[PDB]
Amino acid sequence: YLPAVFEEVLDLVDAVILTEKTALHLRALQNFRDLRGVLHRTGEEWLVTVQDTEAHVPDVYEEVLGVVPITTLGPRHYCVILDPMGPDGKNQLGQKRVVKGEKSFFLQPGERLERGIQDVYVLSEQQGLLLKALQPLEEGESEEKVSHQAGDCWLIRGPLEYVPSAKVEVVEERQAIPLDQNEGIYVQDVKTGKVRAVIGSTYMLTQDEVLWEKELPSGVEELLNSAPRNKTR
Amino acid sequence: YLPAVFEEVLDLVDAVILTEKTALHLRALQNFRDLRGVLHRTGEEWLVTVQDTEAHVPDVYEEVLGVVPITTLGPRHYCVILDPMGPDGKNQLGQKRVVKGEKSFFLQPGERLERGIQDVYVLSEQQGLLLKALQPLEEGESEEKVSHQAGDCWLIRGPLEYVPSAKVEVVEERQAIPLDQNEGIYVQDVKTGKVRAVIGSTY
């Protein structure tokens, strides 16, 4: 290209190589039309992938911010996207989506993850997850398909795979209670305060139950005759 | 070749010798057509083997990354390929395939192995493998052909050969319990906590 007399050359522009693992983040410096014919007003941000071109050329009306890697969710990996895209095409500020099921996508502009590619909760028949329904009475969208009020607690158990829904928060992992005959733990139903001792087979604390403290007045050394005894046992 | 006046010589290019044990990894610097007539857009990566040519010539539109050795799986060797090829021809990012049965292949671009040419689990009548079904209820694709829920545990035993499926993980190798008459171990069924003493034959 011979630079015309009325033209002056600044520098050469290199088209960033667009792979299946990379995307180009661009913002418009002015109202214009890109190479593929997409309206881009000033301040708008968009993504360019291999579906558009194999190597997009940075334009004078396009400002490059960086390269967006494809966040790949594995078969047991989930993620919570903050400030997502709505169907209108804007940041849904203040909300969050949950994505799972072997998905691979590029981070749309103005998005960031809660933790980032979390491991999906897998729990056996001897594991449990305590949950709190922090939002107004989700009847569906849960494994149980049962409404949970705004604030209460419940336990999910069984050899299944759980993922934190967009309206629930995990509290703790219920485990570590193996029980034998004539052996047990003191449990207190915090809802109504009915302290009781479960004896026999392995028992897991219900949503409203918790371990209870049993005190023996000056009787520990008599019945125990190094390590401190489990008072909840 | 007499270099033409309008041409200028850079250097000579040597065709990499393609053997049955080697493959050429290439990426396109621009949209072009290779020697054999294959469309190659910018950024695409492909492999060239003896099936294509005995010695492929690095082109100006082709960038050489390295040589891909043929990962040979022995008769008792398996492997778990991360980010495999789907039928469409792209990296299946986040998934994994299991390959066994005396297979020999070249690593497709954008692939790497979990451990690499693992020894296939062979267990006798006195050996066992504890497994956890970490994915949703595989009815088939297992030796037992029985569904296992998402998280529970089960034991596989017998003089067979096992390979970790693409949906299961191995936990431990059950062994070291030889028992004689009036001899035994105290065992606890953790599911229900029924502690009991097994006595007599090996258990």
Side-chain angles (χ1 to χ4, degrees):
Chain A
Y1 185 81
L2 186 75
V5 290
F6 39 82
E7 306 178 316
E8 67 94 15
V9 170
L10 281 74
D11 58 327
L12 279 161
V13 182
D14 184 74
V16 187
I17 304 299
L18 280 167
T19 68
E20 69 272 15
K21 295 186 178 63
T22 50
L24 194 63
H25 193 276
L26 297 182
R27 63 153 319 280
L29 295 159
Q30 38 182 293
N31 295 39
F32 79 112
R33 172 255 183 199
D34 74 327
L35 303 177
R36 293 163 289 284
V38 187
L39 189 149
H40 287 142
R41 291 184 291 113
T42 314
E44 293 184 356
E45 300 175 14
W46 59 91
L47 289 186
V48 176
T49 58
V50 291
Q51 280 91 328
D52 291 331
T53 55
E54 40 264 32
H56 190 48
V57 177
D59 190 359
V60 294
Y61 317 130
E62 301 174 345
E63 181 178 0
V64 192
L65 275 69
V67 58
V68 180
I70 180 176
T71 289
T72 296
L73 299 177
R76 303 180 308 284
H77 295 105
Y78 77 97
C79 70
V80 180
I81 298 169
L82 296 176
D83 306 342
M85 294 298 102
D88 48 47
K90 295 181 178 176
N91 281 124
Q92 203 174 11
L93 287 90
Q95 287 174 53
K96 47 192 170 68
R97 293 182 299 180
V98 286
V99 191
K100 189 203 167 299
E102 190 57 32
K103 315 300 184 188
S104 296
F105 63 94
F106 293 104
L107 270 295
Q108 286 275 71
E111 298 189 351
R112 186 267 182 275
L113 277 296
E114 282 198 325
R115 297 285 75 78
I117 298 169
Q118 303 90 20
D119 203 358
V120 169
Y121 287 120
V122 65
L123 72 164
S124 73
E125 73 276 14
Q126 311 184 158
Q127 303 182 50
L129 270 71
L130 176 49
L131 311 169
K132 290 180 186 293
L134 56 82
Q135 277 180 358
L137 286 145
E138 47 189 1
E139 171 66 29
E141 74 190 357
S142 290
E143 302 68 19
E144 68 274 14
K145 264 91 190 169
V146 181
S147 59
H148 283 305
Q149 218 163 318
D152 68 311
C153 311
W154 82 93
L155 169 60
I156 182 166
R157 189 169 165 76
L160 280 191
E161 45 183 329
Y162 187 72
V163 57
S165 184
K167 297 182 72 68
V168 67
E169 184 185 29
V170 62
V171 189
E172 58 166 310
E173 193 273 330
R174 297 288 187 183
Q175 205 170 4
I177 309 170
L179 281 194
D180 300 322
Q181 304 101 298
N182 309 142
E183 189 173 31
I185 307 296
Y186 300 110
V187 298
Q188 177 178 32
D189 197 321
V190 186
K191 265 192 164 67
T192 184
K194 300 289 94 175
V195 59
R196 190 257 186 182
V198 61
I199 311 293
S201 61
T202 63
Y203 176 74
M204 185 64 72
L205 294 146
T206 60
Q207 53 174 73
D208 304 317
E209 275 186 359
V210 73
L211 60 84
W212 183 79
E213 180 69 24
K214 175 66 171 67
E215 304 289 344
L216 294 174
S218 307
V220 176
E221 193 48 284
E222 289 83 351
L223 282 72
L224 272 292
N225 191 1
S226 299
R229 55 166 267 267
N230 191 306
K231 270 72 69 178
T232 64
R233 189 78 58 180
Chain B
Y1 185 81
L2 186 75
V5 290
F6 39 82
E7 306 178 316
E8 67 94 15
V9 170
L10 281 74
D11 59 327
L12 279 161
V13 182
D14 184 74
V16 187
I17 304 299
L18 280 167
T19 68
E20 69 272 15
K21 295 186 178 63
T22 50
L24 194 63
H25 193 276
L26 297 182
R27 63 153 319 280
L29 295 159
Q30 37 182 293
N31 295 39
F32 79 112
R33 172 255 183 199
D34 74 327
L35 303 177
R36 294 163 289 284
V38 187
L39 189 149
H40 287 141
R41 291 184 291 113
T42 314
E44 293 184 356
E45 300 175 14
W46 59 91
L47 289 186
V48 176
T49 58
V50 292
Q51 280 91 328
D52 291 331
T53 55
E54 40 264 32
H56 190 48
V57 177
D59 190 359
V60 294
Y61 317 130
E62 301 174 345
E63 181 178 0
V64 192
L65 275 70
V67 58
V68 180
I70 180 176
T71 289
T72 296
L73 299 177
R76 303 180 308 284
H77 295 105
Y78 77 97
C79 70
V80 180
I81 298 169
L82 296 176
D83 306 342
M85 294 298 102
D88 48 47
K90 295 181 178 176
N91 281 124
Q92 203 174 11
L93 287 90
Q95 287 174 53
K96 47 192 170 68
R97 293 182 299 180
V98 286
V99 191
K100 189 203 167 299
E102 190 57 32
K103 315 300 184 188
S104 296
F105 63 94
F106 293 104
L107 270 295
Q108 286 275 71
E111 298 189 351
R112 186 267 182 275
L113 277 296
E114 282 198 325
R115 297 285 75 78
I117 298 169
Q118 303 90 20
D119 203 358
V120 169
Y121 287 120
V122 65
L123 72 164
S124 73
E125 73 276 14
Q126 311 184 158
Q127 303 182 50
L129 270 71
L130 176 49
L131 311 169
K132 290 180 186 293
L134 56 82
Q135 277 180 358
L137 286 145
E138 47 189 1
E139 171 66 29
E141 74 189 357
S142 290
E143 302 68 19
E144 68 274 14
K145 264 91 190 169
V146 181
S147 59
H148 283 305
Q149 218 163 318
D152 68 311
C153 311
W154 82 93
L155 169 60
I156 182 166
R157 189 169 165 76
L160 280 191
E161 45 183 329
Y162 187 72
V163 57
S165 184
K167 296 182 72 68
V168 67
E169 184 185 29
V170 62
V171 189
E172 58 166 310
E173 193 273 330
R174 297 288 187 183
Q175 205 170 4
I177 309 170
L179 281 194
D180 300 322
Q181 304 101 298
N182 309 142
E183 189 173 31
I185 307 296
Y186 300 110
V187 298
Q188 177 178 32
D189 197 321
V190 186
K191 265 192 164 67
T192 184
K194 300 289 94 175
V195 59
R196 190 257 186 182
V198 60
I199 311 293
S201 61
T202 63
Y203 176 74

